[PDB]
Design a protein that fits this description.
part of a larger assembly, 2 chains, about 100 residues, mainly beta, two-stranded antiparallel sheet, two-stranded antiparallel ribbon, 1 helix, 4 strands, binds 2'-deoxyadenosine-5'-monophosphate, Capsid protein (chain A), virus, Icosahedral Capsid, AAV8, Hum8
């Protein structure tokens, strides 16, 4: 696996087998540099126009994170229709995650 | 042409009849056929069971389909149920064609 070979393939599909369904999604992402590689103290307080309810103290990092935690990530509108018209319930079982074809 | 499955050998037709029971005849022989019978009728139960083969839909369409559904709004009676008098009715004809396929 060098610079001239791809490290993965595009998988977007859904498979309905009996009592289970498997969804798979592929997307393209872009990751910037955040903060200029720095950790930074952040805060908000009542000294400004902020009311006491909105105050906070924390940190922003130079890191990104992945979020797949919405349903439209995993279901097409037609797949969601098959689910809700035919079934009394559903729950998640297991997941797989891949990150591939990286270029800097 | 009314729609359906054409069959060279369709399900066979089933014939049923009450057997005639003669009323008391004369005590001296006559050769004419007997025209006098006891009045009868019969009742019972009938069962029929059909196995159907299904063709599953396999489609990459992104957007949702058209479906047959029941009306959401309030109503004086339920569709496909009995009324106050005990009469069962069918409100509308229902066809078979909702899902789509490429031509
Ligand atoms: N309902 C029904 N019953 C019997 N025969 C039928 C029916 N509909 C079509 N056909 C016949 C018409 C053609 O001879 C054949 C289709 O050829 P192939 O290319 O599928 O099947």
């Amino acid at each position: 696996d060098g610079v001239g070979s791809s490290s993965g393939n595009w998988h977007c599909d859904s498979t309905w087998l009996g009592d289970r369904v498997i969804t798979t999604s592929t997307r393209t992402w872009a990751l910037p540099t955040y903060n200029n590689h720095l950790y930074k103290q952040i805060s908000n307080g009542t000294s400004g126009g902020a009311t006491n309810d909105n105050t906070y103290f924390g940190y922003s990092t130079p890191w990104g994170y992945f979020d797949f935690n919405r349903f439209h990530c995993h279901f097409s509108p037609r797949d969601w229709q098959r689910l809700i018209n035919n079934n009394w319930g559903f729950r998640p079982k297991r997941l797989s995650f891949k990150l591939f074809n990286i270029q800097v | 042409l009314m729609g359906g499955f054409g069959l060279k050998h369709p399900p066979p037709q089933i014939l049923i009849k009450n057997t005639p029971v003669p009323a008391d005849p004369r005590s001296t022989f006559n050769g004419d056929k007997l025209n006098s019978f006891i009045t009868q009728y019969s009742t019972g139960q009938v069962s029929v069971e059909i196995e159907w083969e299904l063709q599953k839909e396999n489609s990459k369409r992104w957007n949702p389909e058209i479906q047959y559904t029941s009306n959401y709004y309030k109503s004086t009676s339920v569709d496909f149920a009995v009324n106050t008098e005990g009469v069962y009715s069918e409100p509308r004809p229902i066809g078979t064609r909702y899902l789509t396929r490429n031509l």
